[PDB]
Amino acid sequence: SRQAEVNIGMVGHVDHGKTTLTKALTGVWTDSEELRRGITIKIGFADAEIRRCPNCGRYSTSPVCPYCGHETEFVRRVSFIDAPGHEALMTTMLAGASLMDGAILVIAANEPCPRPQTREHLMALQIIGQKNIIIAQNKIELVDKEKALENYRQIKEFIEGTVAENAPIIPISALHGANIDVLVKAIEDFIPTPKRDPNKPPKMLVLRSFDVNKPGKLVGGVLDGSIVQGKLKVGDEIEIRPGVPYEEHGRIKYEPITTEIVSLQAGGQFVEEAYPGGLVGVGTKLDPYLTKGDLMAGNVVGKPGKLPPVWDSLRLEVHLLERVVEQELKVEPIKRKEVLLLNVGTARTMGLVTGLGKDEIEVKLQIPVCAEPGDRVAISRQIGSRWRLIGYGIIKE
Ligand SMILES: Nc1nc2c(ncn2[C@@H]2O[C@H](COP(=O)(O)OP(=O)(O)NP(=O)(O)O)[C@@H](O)[C@H]2O)c(=O)[nH]1
Ligand SMILES: [Mg+2]
Numbered sequence: 001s002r003q004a005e006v007n008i009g010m011v012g013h014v015d016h017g018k019t020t021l022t023k024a025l026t027g028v029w030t031d032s033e034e035l036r037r038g039i040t041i042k043i044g045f046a047d048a049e050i051r052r053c054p055n056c057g058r059y060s061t062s063p064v065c066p067y068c069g070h071e072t073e074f075v076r077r078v079s080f081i082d083a084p085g086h087e088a089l090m091t092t093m094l095a096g097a098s099l100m101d102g103a104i105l106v107i108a109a110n111e112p113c114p115r116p117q118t119r120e121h122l123m124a125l126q127i128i129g130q131k132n133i134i135i136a137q138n139k140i141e142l143v144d145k146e147k148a149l150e151n152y153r154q155i156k157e158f159i160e161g162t163v164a165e166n167a168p169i170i171p172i173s174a175l176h177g178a179n180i181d182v183l184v185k186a187i188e189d190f191i192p193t194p195k196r197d198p199n200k201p202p203k204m205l206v207l208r209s210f211d212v213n214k215p216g217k218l219v220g221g222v223l224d225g226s227i228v229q230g231k232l233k234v235g236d237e238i239e240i241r242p243g244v245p246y247e248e249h250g251r252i253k254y255e256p257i258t259t260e261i262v263s264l265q266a267g268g269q270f271v272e273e274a275y276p277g278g279l280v281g282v283g284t285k286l287d288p289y290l291t292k293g294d295l296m297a298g299n300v301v302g303k304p305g306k307l308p309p310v311w312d313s314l315r316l317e318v319h320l321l322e323r324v325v326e327q328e329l330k331v332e333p334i335k336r337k338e339v340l341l342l343n344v345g346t347a348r349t350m351g352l353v354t355g356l357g358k359d360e361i362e363v364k365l366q367i368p369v370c371a372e373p374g375d376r377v378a379i380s381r382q383i384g385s386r387w388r389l390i391g392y393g394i395i396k397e
């Protein structure tokens with residue numbers, strides 16, 4: 001029960017310090033681990049153990065207090081989430097809000113607030129309703145007291161009326177590890193572990209799938225992912241949707257598959273039960289041939305008879321983005337016949353617009369997806385030679 005309890009998204013404009021701050025909190029100064037990153041949504045996890053020193057009472061993420069040297073006491077393990085680049089981060093938030101429990105918005109003190117990407121990240125948090133926010137006013141050592149206060153006022157102006165209006169603004173130097181203890185304390189006070197109902201039907205979004213048996217006992221396929229509801233236990237019988245692809249009359253169909261959990265890895269150790277928070281590795285009895293090479297990435301795991309429906313096509317209530325991040329801002333209306341890229345949970349599929357409606361579109365999916373009515377779907381359009389997020393859609397019945 002010491003695995004990560006909450007996922008904290010790291011957001012903020014490019015180079016404002018997200019990665020440096022993550023490293024300051026996790027204690028990583030070497031190293032790669034990029035091999036476990038998602039491939040649909042490029043999400044990565046970095047765990048840290050929050051501890052409190054009995055002597056000076058200050059918080060840190062190390063077994064030994066950085067301030068007095070005394071041994072600290074375990075408080076809680078958390079996981080910090082990231083994605084490579086602005087677009088990947090925006091897509092992650094819009095498609096996988098269920099994967100975040102809070103966020104640290106990193107704002108550089110030596111640049112006017114808010115920068116373009118800073119505005120869009122807050123916009124995404126606003127859209128998904130994520131209010132457990134902490135603001136890290138980074139690179140504070142690079143500015144004088146006057147400019148630091150001015151930057152502070154700009155941040156206050158910026159967050160007023162938003163989901164971050166009640167967020168603490170913590171001046172720090174992620175690079176030099178200055179005032180980090182105050183930030184760690186803020187994580188405890190502003191991003192508390194939610195009161196989750198461990199008895200709701202389990203649901204895990206698969207991020208990756210492998211065959212962990214050496215090149216060449218032969219162990220079953222492994223599924224790595226995020227539990228977003230309920231819990232998983234060794235011995236549990238589980239169903240995976242959409243499932244295994246097969247051909248019928250020259251077309252591709254998917255068959256949900258059932259298996260059993262043999263092992264569970266979470267927080268760097270094998271456990272008998274896993275929960276929301278951090279990455280969870282699920283050992284199954286599945287033939288490794290079915291999980292090898294991420295064949296099940298994007299699938300959903302649950303208990304038999306308690307999984308969301310599978311869709312071959314989606315009816316979406318569409319909400320186009322009011323973006324500010326090279327011209328090409330004005331988002332052109334979605335047209336019938338257009339092929340868009342959709343991200344829902346950890347699933348990714350191209351979609352053909354087959355019909356238009358009032359603030360709604362009908363899309364035929366290249367690959368079926370497992371999702372619930374009401375779930376949010378990130379919508380991207382290929383502009384030139386790359387995919388750009390243009391909005392999001394809500395699955396309708
Ligand atoms: N002087 C100073 N430089 C800092 C501080 N924090 C980060 N930097 C520097 O700012 C640069 C970018 O930091 P980085 O953590 O990579 O930023 P990021 O937000 O993760 N970048 P990206 O959005 O591209 O992933 C690096 O050169 C880093 O060392 C700080 O407190 N002081
Ligand atoms: Mg970074």
Ligand SMILES: [Zn+2]
Pocket residue numbers: 053054055056057058065066067068069070
């Ligand atoms: Zn101490």
